[PDB]
């Protein structure tokens, strides 16, 4: 019950839906730091029937689709399929997208994502981008830009 756990956590009054207040205060009470336009981007993406409310199916679907996207990004970065992402792979991937960066810049990115202080694996990746509403590698790169300060 991934998304059941999350939803049950967020739905404070237990009326079966999560409103924007519950999402905000919820994310803060779970310790996930998000800006209002990120949270609102999540909400607008999730509210398929546009009633200003997230029911369980909408929530579950958003997180499912998002997880698929992030998994796709991960597997697109992992060139040698070792289930991990090395800095050189970030360099190559960004190079195919017309960005030339150095090894220490990629290392900087990875360290911004890693906690083990090694390179990042699928668990850290997934956890890091779980509530980050980036939709693809481009948006991930833009996020890396305002996160690390490097202009990429
Ligand atoms: Ca509610
Ligand atoms: Ca809705
Ligand atoms: Ca790899
Ligand atoms: Ca690591």
Numbering used by the authors: 22 to 139, 141 to 174
Quote the paper.
The mitochondrial ATP-Mg/Pi carrier (APC) is a member of the mitochondrial carrier family of transport proteins. APC is involved in the import of cytosolic adenine nucleotides into the mitochondrion and the export of inorganic phosphate from the mitochondrial matrix. Therefore, APC has the important role of altering the mitochondrial adenine nucleotide pool in order to adapt to changing cellular energetic demands. The N-terminal domain of APC forms a calcium-sensitive regulatory domain.
The consequence of calcium binding to the regulatory domain of APC is a stimulation of the substrate transport activity of the carrier. A structure of the regulatory domain of human APC isoform-1 has recently been solved, confirming the presence of four EF-hands, each of which is occupied by a bound calcium ion in a canonical pentagonal bi-pyramidal fashion. The EF-hands group together into two pairs, forming two lobes connected by a long central α-helix, in a similar fashion to the four EF-hands of calmodulin. The linker region between the N-terminal regulatory domain and the C-terminal carrier domain contains an amphipathic α-helix of unknown function. In the structure this α-helix is bound to EF-hand pair 3 and 4, analogous to the binding of a calmodulin recognition sequence motif to the hydrophobic pockets in the EF-hands of calmodulin. The protein construct used in the previous study of the HsAPC-1 regulatory domain was mutated at the extreme N-terminus to replace a cysteine residue at position 15 with a serine, raising the possibility that a native dimer could have been disrupted. Therefore, the mechanism that couples calcium binding in the regulatory domain to substrate transport in the carrier domain has not been resolved. Here, an independent structural determination of the native human APC-1 regulatory domain was completed, which was combined with an investigation into the oligomeric state of the full-length human APC-1 protein. Furthermore, an extensive comparison of the conformations of EF-hand proteins in the calcium-free, calcium-bound and peptide-bound state was undertaken, which has allowed us to propose a mechanism for the regulation of APC that is consistent with all available experimental data.
